[PDB]
């Protein structure tokens, strides 16, 4: 299918408790493969997936240098942000960034990303053209002018079309047994009376990878979106994910309800019902 590589940076100030912590994590799809944490006893890029371990020392050194340099850059960015928002040096603030590349099913670049936030609010984003910026407020317009002056977008475009795509394809090959394997959900419906005249039907999906899934309930073939309780997809801990969707139905009407499952690992969408 389609694949993506993303890096996620978080830089968190903490006045009175040292310099801001910088954490970077790298993912292919829903699989983490590297981490860097400036609070580690020995900060360095660490492997988080078996297929990255084969990379040579030049690889670990290049990425560790980048992350050490970013630690300093985002500490300065946190100081700059205080000035842009007229904020005091007494509070804790957070800068976050996510960047990377998406491939289509052919394997070509579908689109690139580089978006940043301050205190959990959008700050600035590279536009889909990989040439211009959208700033969220007048502070980020100051950053925008700096990056336009420095032609930062041209450098990011070169990374997103080049190194990002090339190395994503490399990781997909080296990790093909896992990164290119979809595991379909194991599905079942459970039944829980809530009273003498209603019962909960809960449609479960377990053991699936990647995380993207659609679970929906129909009553007499009509979607029950407003009446459906849908939990957030959650990690099992073994790389796979879990999810459920529940509806409260009148007792004696259970067979009017069907659960519909869509997942990349399924050749066709699945329809299931309560089987008493």
């Amino acid at each position: 299918g389609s694949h993506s590589m993303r890096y996620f940076y978080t830089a968190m100030s903490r006045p009175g408790r040292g310099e801001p912590r910088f954490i970077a994590v790298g993912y292919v799809d829903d699989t983490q493969f590297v981490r860097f944490d400036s609070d580690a006893a020995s900060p360095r890029t660490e492997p988080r997936a078996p297929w990255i371990e084969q990379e040579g020392p030049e690889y670990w050194d290049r990425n560790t240098q980048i992350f050490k340099t970013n630690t300093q850059t985002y500490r300065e960015n946190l100081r700059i942000a205080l000035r842009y928002y007229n904020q005091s040096e007494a509070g804790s603030h957070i800068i976050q960034r996510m960047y990377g590349c998406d491939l289509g099913p052919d394997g070509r670049l579908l689109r690139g990303h580089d978006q940043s936030a301050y205190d959990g609010k959008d700050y600035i984003a590279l536009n889909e053209d990989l040439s211009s910026w959208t700033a969220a407020d007048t502070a980020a317009q100051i950053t925008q002018r700096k990056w336009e002056a420095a032609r930062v977008a041209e450098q990011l475009r070169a990374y997103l079309e080049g190194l990002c795509v090339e190395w994503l394809r490399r990781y997909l090959e080296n990790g093909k047994e896992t990164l290119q394997r979809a595991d379909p959900p194991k599905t079942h419906v459970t039944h829980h009376p809530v009273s003498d005249h209603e019962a909960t039907l809960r449609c479960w999906a377990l053991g699936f990878y990647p995380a993207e899934i659609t679970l929906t309930w129909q009553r007499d073939g009509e979607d029950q979106t407003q009446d459906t309780e849908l939990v957030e997809t959650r990690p099992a801990g073994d790389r796979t994910f879990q999810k459920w969707a529940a509806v409260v139905v009148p007792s004696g009407e259970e067979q009017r309800y069907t659960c519909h499952v869509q997942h990349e690992g399924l050749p066709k969408p699945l329809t299931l019902r309560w089987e008493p």
């Binding site: 290049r62 990425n63 980048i66 340099t69 300065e76 960015n77 700059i80 450098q155 190194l163």
Partner: peptide, 9 residues
């Protein structure tokens, strides 16, 4: 592979 471009705010 991380990006090496510096993003100075």
């Amino acid at each position: 592979q991380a990006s090496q471009e510096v993003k100075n705010w």
